[PDB]
Symmetry: C2
Subunit: 200 residues, 2 copies
């Protein structure tokens, strides 16, 4: 049933294993924050993970939605971005801490983010992004395995706890772009145009 | 017969316009800017310095055929060029080259794509005749660097980081980076006249699976 729904839209594509996993009926949130100029080949990242960062309908806004099934999830994503999109998510590895950045791929500023809520039931809180650039960041871990994670840089750097901006980056709102990674439980939908980059 | 040669190997692909251009039968520009790997990041402001002349050697890397190491070769036709490339890398490869824009100076880096350490570089010599000096690369990582210019146009350039940072004018390392050989990785860009052949594996990156 589920893949039927999917293949109707994107025939001759499977659900990617990341998404396929998130659709099954505690977590880690990466806590590390950084500036854009720290995304470069050879950057050593020591990743700090926290056990702690709809039911709360905060979708007063049309640009926000609370998806309960793959059908509704796709519906919302395409309603904002159209059909030519792919879902991505981070793939931090189980007990690895230290990674080296291999490269940094710009995914642009139009996307939909979906956060898998920690309930047993498949539930995602989905919303559009604004004033923000997304990146895909391939990395190699200490044990030699290669993976990748999604980073988000907020450039309208307002509307956040000035204290944490200061804590992490010794800066206060409005001035400079603050970036952080997303956890494996997030899905981000992105246009195919962005991904192709040079190749299209 | 030109495209026949190509389409025989890669059917339902054209020669890409950059390569197509380089295969046509004076002076060019060599970018002179050098940098460290940690300067390749989103939002880096690059002011590009261009020279009408290389510095002694092509940065640090043939009618004389200083090509007598086998790892080097001197290609005179698209057929020979392809032959050499595939002989070293196999068939599943693409050629890339930089596309600096005519009189632009200042660019912002959008992103940085790792193409790995296996590749073949081909430099189009300045003869009327189609001639390239081709060689394999070693102790070096290649990158594709998308950029937006001051005038708003988007393009991309190839960068090369030498990590076995030997085998170069220590003078220029010092001039540009106030450093001498052996210590740290030195990077620079390639001119629009270079072609680099790269495996498809590298390019796909994540999108392999
Ligand atoms: Cu954020
Ligand atoms: Cu070089």
């Amino acid at each position: 049933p589920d893949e039927d729904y999917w293949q109707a839209v994107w025939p001759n594509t499977p659900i990617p294993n990341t998404l396929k996993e998130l659709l099954k009926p505690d977590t880690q949130y990466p806590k590390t924050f950084f500036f854009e100029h720290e995304l470069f080949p050879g950057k050593k990242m020591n990743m700090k993970f926290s056990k702690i960062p709809c039911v709360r309908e905060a979708g007063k806004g049309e640009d926000k939605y609370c998806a309960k099934s793959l059908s509704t999830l796709i519906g919302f994503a395409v309603s904002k971005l159209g059909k030519n999109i792919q879902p991505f998510s981070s793939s931090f590895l189980d007990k690895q801490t230290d990674y080296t950045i291999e490269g940094v791929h710009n995914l642009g500023d139009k996307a939909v983010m979906c956060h898998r809520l920690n309930f047993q039931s498949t539930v995602f809180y989905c919303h559009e992004i604004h004033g923000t650039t997304a990146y895909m960041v391939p990395m190699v871990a200490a044990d030699g395995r290669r993976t990748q994670a999604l980073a988000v840089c907020h450039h309208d750097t307002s509307g956040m706890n000035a204290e944490v901006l200061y804590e992490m980056l010794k800066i206060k709102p409005g001035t400079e772009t603050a970036c952080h990674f997303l956890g494996n439980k997030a899905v981000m939908w992105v246009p195919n145009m962005a991904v192709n980059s040079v190749y299209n």
